[PDB]
From Swiss-Prot, chain C:
Family stated for the protein in its record: Belongs to the cyclic nucleotide phosphodiesterase family. PDE2 subfamily.
Organism field: Homo sapiens
Effect recorded for Y238F: Loss of 3',5'-cyclic-AMP phosphodiesterase activity. Decreased 3',5'-cyclic-GMP phosphodiesterase activity
Assembly and interaction partners: Homodimer.
Residues the entry annotates as binding Zn(2+): H71, H107, D108, D219
An annotated GO BP: positive regulation of vascular permeability
Disease annotated for this entry: Intellectual developmental disorder with paroxysmal dyskinesia or seizures: An autosomal recessive disorder characterized by global developmental delay, impaired intellectual development, language delay, and early-onset paroxysmal hyperkinetic movement disorder that manifests as sudden falls or backward propulsion, eye or head deviation, and dystonic limb posturing followed by chorea and dyskinetic movements. Some patients may also develop epileptic seizures or only have seizures without a movement disorder.
Lineage of origin: Eukaryota, Metazoa, Chordata, Craniata, Vertebrata
Name of this chain's protein: cGMP-dependent 3',5'-cyclic phosphodiesterase
PDEase domain span: 1-313
Length: 340, 335, 327, 336
C-alpha cells in the first residue's frame, strides 16, 4: 500500500500548490480540512513552492520515500498524530508565504524548520514527559537524565528515518551542511518542549525589546524556537470551530493518560483527571499564560502577524462566553435526575 | 472439483450485492456455494494473482479443507466459512493494509479456513478428562484442539495436489507456516485471556506499525474478532448460534456426567441458565474484544455497537425462560 | 516366553554385548527381560498384546547405520542390566522402571539418521509440526509410540487404572524427551546437585531427574562394553553424521565440522565426545550407584584405547599398494 | 540457519571448546569467530544463568546473534573485542569465585554488559562525537560518556526487540534493577569514569571488600568491568602487540578525519606525530598496571594478571628502540 502510494507520488508529478485549495496560503485556511490521503502530496507541493526541492537538489524518489516514512512514523492518538504534524508543517509554510522569513533567517534554517515541523512529534504515544518518568518507560530509561524525554525520542526517530536506506534526503549534502541540518533539527525539535519555551521566554522578550538583529546568531536561534512554538500551537489561531475540536482532541488524550495514571495508583494532575478538569478554565489559562504571549511576541517581531494574535485573543473570549453552558440549567435533555 | 473449474472464479458482486458489507450474513449462503465464495474472496483481495497461486491447487485445497470439518452443531465448515468471510470483511472495510503486511493478511484468511479442522464439538479440558489421543499428544504443551487443527492443516498442505504454497520462496513458505501456527494457536480462548492485558497495552500506547510484537498481537485480536463474528450480525444470528453452541456444550456435559465428572455449569443442561450465560459471555468476553478492535480501527465502531445491541436484545427476552401460566400444550407432565 | 538363562548365561552381566544377539531373536529377548523383571505378571500385561506391541515397535524403526532397531534393543537391554545389577526397585517405583524400559524400546522410533537441526534446516513436515516446541525428533518418536499403542491389539496398558495409564503416558513422554542431548546438557547441573546432596527416594523431583540420567546412560551404553563395540559404533555414527553433512552440502549449507567428511578428524572428535559427554554421565551414575563403577572404568579404558590408536589416522610409510596415487 | 544450529543443537559443554578455556592463559581471540556465539551459550550455561533466570533458549539464541550483529567492523571495537571481554568476565567468575562476592543478578548483569558494552562503535571516541556534533552528542548533551550512553541504548533496543528479551523472567522490580545495573556497568567503561573513581577503588582495596557494603558492590562492578575491557593486556606478548596494531589503526583513522574537518587531533591520534611505543608504555604504566594491581589487592588469585601486564610493559620497553630505524629498512632502500 505504501508501495502504490510511493509510485503515484513519484511518477504522477507534484500538484501545484494552488490546486489544493484557493485559500491554501492564507492564515484563514484550516489545513485539517484536507483529506489525510492528500497530505503527503501537499507536503511535496509546499516544498516545491518554497523552492527547496530545486535549491537543495533533493532526489525525488528519496523525498517521496521520506515523506511516506514520516507519515508512517506517527501513531493515532486523538491529537498527536500525522494530521497534527501536517497542520504544524502547513503553518510553517504560511509563515514563509506571509511573513518574509528570508529577511530574518538563512535558507537552510527555514528548510530545517519545515522538516522539523513534519518530524517534531514522531512516534508520540499520547502521553507526556511526566508520564514517561513516572511509568519508568523505555524512553525515560534512555533520556530522563537529559530531560525533554519525548522530544529527544522524536528527534531520534527523525534521524532513524534519515538513516533508513533510500530515505536520506540530505545525503548529498557536504559534511558541514549535513552537520548543520542535523544540529538545527536537534535544536528546533527540542524547542517544542513547552518547558524549554518557558525557560527562554525572557530571552525572547529581550530580543523583541531590543529589536531583531540578523547578524546575531543567538537571535537566529531564539527566533527559530519562537517560530516552531508558533507552529505547534497554531490550531489556536484559526476559527472557533477549530479550537473547539482541538480542545476535544487534546483533552481526550490527556484524560486517557489520567486514567492510566489512576490505574497505576498515582494521582494525576487536575488537567489530566476527567473527574476534576474544568475545560473552559484550563483552556482560558492556557491561552492567557502560554498562547497569547507567544503570538504577541510574534506580532512584535512581525507586524503582519497581528491577525494571529487577534484570533487567539478572540478565541479566548469565545471560551469565556460559552463557559456558562458547562453548567446544567433546568433538567438534562433526559428529563432525568438519574445521573445523580 | 468439476463445478468450480467449470464456472471459473465469480466476481464478488455476482454472489450478492451486499457480500462485502458488515450487515451481510454469510450463513445465508447455501453450503454448496461456499467453496466458490472462498475463491471469489481470495480473487477480490487479489491474493491469487499477487502470490501466483495455482488455481486448481487452490480449489483442491479449499475442498480438502471443507472436507476436513466434521458435523457437530456449531464447530463445522459453515463456522469456518463465516469466520473466513469476516476476515474478508475486515480487509474490505478496515484499512488493514495500513497496519499489516500482505502475507500477514493472507495467512490470517487461510488460518480462518483451517482454524477448527476436525473439531469434535468438545473443548480442551474434555480431551484431557477423556484421555483422548489428542490429549496424549498435546496436553503437556496446552491448547490441545488448536495444536490438532494446525497439524490437520499441515497434513492438508502436504497432501498431493493441495500445496498452495509449494512455489513460494523458502523465506515466504516459512513465513506462512509460522504465521498460521501462531494465528491458529491464538484461537484458544485461554490464550486470548492470557494476552488480553498486552492487547490493552497496545491499544493504550497506540499501534506501532514498526513493532513486530504489535503485528503479532493485532493478528491475534483479528483472529478472535473473526471467531466471534456471529455476534456482530442481527438478533436471528446470535439466537441461532446460541442454540448451536449450547447444543454442543450440553452434549459435552452429558458425556462428562457419564464419565462420573461434574461438568461446568454452562455445559450442564440441568443447571445452565442460557440468558445469563449468554449475557455474561457477550458483556465480558465479546464486547471487550470489539471495543479493542474499535480502539484500533474507528471504522469498527459499528461492530461493537451491534454486539451491544444484541446483548440488549438478550436482556429483553430473558423473561421468556420463566414459564408463566402453563406450557403451550396446557400440561404439567414436564414436572 | 523363554527364560533369560536360556538365552545366554552371561545375559544379565554388564560384560554382555546385546548386539551379539541375532536380530531375529530380539523380540523374544524383550519378552524374556520383561518376564524376568516380573512386569507381565505384576501389571497383568496381556501376552498376545505385548507380543503384537513388541513387533510393531521393532517394525517402526528404519534402517540407518546407527539409529535402527538394534540400537533400541541394545538400549533396552542396558535398562534391564541396570535393573538387575543396581537393584533399581530400591530407588524408583515399579511403574517408573516399567516406563523406562518401554521408553527405551520406543525412544528412536522412525529415526531418519539425521539430527534435529537438520529437520529444521530442511523444512521437513516434522520441523513444521515440532520446531516451535523443540526436540523435533523426540516429539516424533513419542508420537509414533502413541500411534502404536492406539493400533488395534497393541495397547499394553489398556487395562491399567486411569491413574496408572496417565502416569505411564506422562513418564513415556518425559523419558523420551530426555533423550534429546540438548535436554541432558540443560539439566546437567541439576543432576550434579542431586548427586552431591544424595538421592532422596521421597523426593519426586529426584525420581524425575534419575529417570533422565538412567535413560541417557542406556542411550550411550555402547561406550561401556569393550573395544570392538566402541570402534564399530564410531563407524556407524560417523557414517550417519557424514551422510547428513553430504545432504547439507547439497542444500547449499555448510555442515558442522563433525559432519563434514572432508574436515572431520575422527579420533579427536571421538575422544572429545568420550571425555566431555560420555564420561561425565557414567561418573554421575557411579556417584549415585557405587555398583556402576565398572561402567565408568570401561568408558575411561575405551577412551584410552582411542588415544592409543589415533596415530593410525596418519599415513606412515607407503599405502599397502606401494603407491602415492592418492595425492 | 546459524540460528537453527545454535538453537536446535545442544549447548556445547564448556570444557569441550578447549582444554585451557577456563584459564587466565587462554587467548579467546584464538577461537574462530564462527564459534563464538556457541561459546557465549556455553559460558552462560556453565555459570548457571540459563537455570537461575529461566531463560527461554530460542530467546537467548536470538539475543546472542542480535548482539553480534550490533557490532560494526572497525579494527578494534568489533564483536571479537566484545567476545574476549565477555570471556574474561567468565574467567573472573571461575577463577576468582565471584559468587562469594557479588549477588547472582550482579554477575549476570556484568556478563551481559560485557557482551553489549561497545555496541554500534564506529572506531571514534567521545571527543570525536562532541567536536563533530554527532547525533549521539546531540542526544546525550549534559554529561560525558556519549558513546557509553549509546552502547546502553543499543542494548535496550535489543532487549526490546520481539524475541530477544532474555530478562522476561524478572519481576518488574528486578527488571528495573537489571536495567540500572547495565547502565552503571556500561557507563563504567568510560575510562574517564574509572579515573574519577580511582581513589575510591584504592580506598576499598586498602580497607578490604565488604560484601555488606552497597558502595563496595558498585565499585567492585566497575573495577571488574574495566578489568574485562583491558584484558588483552593480560595475555602474552603476541596479544598486546596485535591489539596495539588494531587500536592505533583506529586512533589514526579518527585523526585523519579530524584533520580533514579542520580540527586538530590529539597527538596519539595523529599518525604524523604519535610514537606508539612511548604511548603504549605510558598506557601500561599509568592506566593498565594500576587496575590489575587493585584487582590483585582485592583478590590474591588475580596476581598472575598484574604480573603479565607488568611483563608485557617491560617487553614494550625492550622493543621500543625498533621504532627508530637503525641500519637499512627491510628492502635495502633509502627511497623513503
Ligand atoms: C503546548 C502544550 C501542548 C502541545 C500539550 C498543548 N497543545 N495544545 C494545542 C494548541 O492548539 C494545547 C496544549 N496544552 C494544553 C494545556 C497545557 C497546560 C495547562 N496547564 C498546566 C498547568 N496549568 C494549566 C492551565 C493547561 C492546558 C491544553 N490545551 C491546548 O490547547
Ligand atoms: C466455543 C468457544 C468460543 C470462544 C470460540 C465461543 N464461540 N462462541 C460463538 C460466538 O459467536 C461462543 C463461545 N464461547 C462461549 C463462552 C466462552 C467463555 C465463557 N466464560 C468463561 C468464563 N467466563 C465466561 C463468560 C462463556 C461462554 C459460549 N458462547 C458463545 O457464543
Ligand atoms: C547421536 C547423539 C547421541 C548423544 C545419542 C550420541 N550417541 N552416540 C552413540 C554412543 O554410543 C554418539 C552420540 N553423540 C555424539 C556427539 C554428541 C555431541 C558432540 N559434541 C557437540 C559439541 N561438542 C561435542 C563433544 C559430539 C559427539 C556422537 N558420537 C557418539 O558416539
Ligand atoms: C580503555 C581505553 C581504550 C579503549 C581507548 C584503549 N583500549 N586499549 C586496549 C586495551 O587492551 C588501549 C586503549 N588506549 C590506549 C591509550 C590510551 C592513553 C594513552 N596515553 C597517552 C598518554 N597518556 C596516556 C594514558 C595511550 C594509549 C591505546 N592502547 C591500548 O592498549
Ligand atoms: Mg511534542
Ligand atoms: Mg477453535
Ligand atoms: Mg534419539
Ligand atoms: Mg567502550
Ligand atoms: Zn506538536
Ligand atoms: Zn472457531
Ligand atoms: Zn537412541
Ligand atoms: Zn570495550
Amino acid at each position: 500500500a505504501m508501495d502504490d502510494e510511493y509510485t503515484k507520488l513519484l511518477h504522477d508529478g507534484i500538484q501545484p500548490v494552488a490546486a489544493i485549495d484557493s485559500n491554501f496560503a492564507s492564515f484563514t485556511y484550516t489545513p485539517r480540512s484536507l483529506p489525510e490521503d492528500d497530505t503527503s502530496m501537499a507536503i511535496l507541493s509546499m516544498l516545491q513552492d518554497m523552492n527547496f526541492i530545486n535549491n537543495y537538489k533533493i532526489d525525488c524518489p528519496t523525498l517521496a520515500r521520506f515523506c511516506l516514512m514520516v507519515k508512517k512514523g506517527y501513531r493515532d492518538p486523538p491529537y498527536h498524530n500525522w494530521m497534527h504534524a501536517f497542520s504544524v508543517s502547513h503553518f510553517c509554510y504560511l509563515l514563509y508565504k506571509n511573513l518574509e522569513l528570508t529577511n530574518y533567517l538563512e535558507d537552510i534554517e527555514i528548510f530545517a524548520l519545515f522538516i522539523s515541523c513534519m518530524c517534531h512529534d514522531l512516534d508520540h504515544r499520547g502521553t507526556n514527559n511526566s508520564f514517561q518518568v513516572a511509568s519508568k518507560s523505555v524512553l525515560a530509561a534512555l533520556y530522563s537524565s537529559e530531560g525533554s524525554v519525548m522530544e529527544r525520542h522524536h528527534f531520534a526517530q527523525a534521524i532513524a528515518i534519515l538513516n533508513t536506506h533510500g530515505c536520506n534526503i540530505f545525503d548529498h549534502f557536504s559534511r558541514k551542511d549535513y552537520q548543520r541540518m542535523l544540529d538545527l533539527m536537534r535544536d528546533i525539535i527540542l524547542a517544542t518542549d513547552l518547558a524549554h519555551h518557558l525557560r527562554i521566554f525572557k530571552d525572547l522578550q529581550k530580543m523583541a525589546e531590543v529589536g531583531y538583529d540578523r547578524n546575531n546568531k543567538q537571535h537566529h536561534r531564539l527566533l527559530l524556537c519562537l517560530l516552531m512554538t508558533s507552529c505547534d500551537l497554531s490550531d489556536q489561531t484559526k476559527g472557533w470551530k477549530t479550537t473547539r475540536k482541538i480542545a476535544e482532541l487534546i483533552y481526550k488524550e490527556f484524560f486517557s493518560q489520567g486514567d492510566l495514571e489512576k490505574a497505576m495508583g498515582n494521582r494525576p494532575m487536575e488537567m489530566m483527571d476527567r473527574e476534576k478538569a474544568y475545560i473552559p478554565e484550563l483552556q482560558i489559562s492556557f491561552m492567557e499564560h502560554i498562547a497569547m504571549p507567544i503570538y504577541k511576541l510574534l506580532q512584535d517581531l512581525f507586524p503582519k502577524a497581528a491577525e494571529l494574535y487577534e484570533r487567539v485573543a478572540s478565541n479566548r473570549e469565545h471560551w469565556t462566553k460559552v463557559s456558562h453552558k458547562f453548567t446544567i440549567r433546568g433538567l438534562p435533555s433526559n428529563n432525568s435526575l438519574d445521573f445523580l
